[PDB]
């Protein structure tokens, strides 16, 4: 019943994308911010980082029982052999989709775009982040599409490090005038040993360590023990 490596890995990718989409459209109101999958012998565990953990778990875990009741009936998980976990996000300034969903459900509640954008900006740069770009395009008011940018701090715009030092989230807002498209790009400062930013330093920059002092006696001396 075995299947090739390419097909099984693409199936795992399909499965993960399916979970991502379902949980993003299902728990965006409850601040869903990420899904991870681990495997133990004859057991699959799924841990869901969320901004609002009290709203992603529910009373007595019932929603989780509901949640596993849904997933187990889609991807082929036999009844009672799958468990769902959730951890609070360490900081909302290391993930872009969290602030993306925050912007969604701040504008969907009825709110000037600028106020929410500036609130997110000050939240991000009180989080020690090194740069935040919130681009909002659509019709802010009237009947014309103007793209506005809320740009704070420096941010890398090219190269390899954009893979890890920059985290990006795209989102759509559905108001009664139309659709507002946002992109949130958050740069991660250098935090080796501590998991806030990337562990590796910025590849193009060089730092020279402070000098080591000298002790140069003019008259040679020996140090017996």
């Amino acid at each position: 019943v075995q299947i090739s490596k390419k097909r099984k890995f693409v199936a795992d990718g399909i499965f993960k994308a399916e979970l991502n989409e379902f949980l993003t459209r299902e728990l965006a109101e409850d601040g869903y911010s990420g899904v991870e999958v681990r495997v133990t012998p004859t057991r699959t565990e799924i841990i869901i980082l969320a901004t609002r953990t009290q709203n992603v778990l529910g009373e007595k875990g019932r929603r989780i029982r509901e949640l596993t009741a849904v997933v187990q009936k889609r991807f082929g998980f036999p009844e009672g052999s799958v468990e769902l976990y959730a951890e609070k996000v360490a900081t909302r300034g290391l993930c872009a989709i969290a602030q993306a969903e925050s912007l969604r459900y701040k504008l969907l509640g009825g709110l000037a775009v600028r106020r929410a954008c500036y609130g997110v900006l000050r939240f991000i740069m009180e989080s020690g982040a090194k740069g935040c770009e919130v681009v909002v395009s659509g019709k802010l008011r009237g009947q014309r599409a103007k793209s506005m940018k809320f740009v704070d701090g420096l941010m890398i715009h090219s190269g390899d490090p954009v893979n890890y030092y920059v985290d990006t989230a795209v989102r759509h807002v559905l108001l009664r005038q139309g659709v507002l498209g946002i992109k949130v790009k958050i740069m991660l400062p250098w935090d080796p040993t501590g998991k806030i930013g990337p562990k590796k330093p910025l590849p193009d920059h060089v730092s020279i360590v402070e000098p080591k002092d000298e002790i140069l006696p003019t008259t040679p001396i020996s140090e017996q023990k």
Binding site: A112, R114, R115, Y118, M148
Partner: peptide
């Protein structure tokens, strides 16, 4: 709503005078 932000965005719009007045209210007086 932060009137500094409202002035930054809407100063050149139909509500430029109103956001200017609100900004001046916030800037001095407390």
């Amino acid at each position: 709503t932060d009137p500094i932000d409202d002035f930054q965005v809407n100063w050149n719009t139909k509500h430029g005078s109103g956001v200017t007045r609100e900004l001046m209210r916030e800037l001095n007086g407390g």
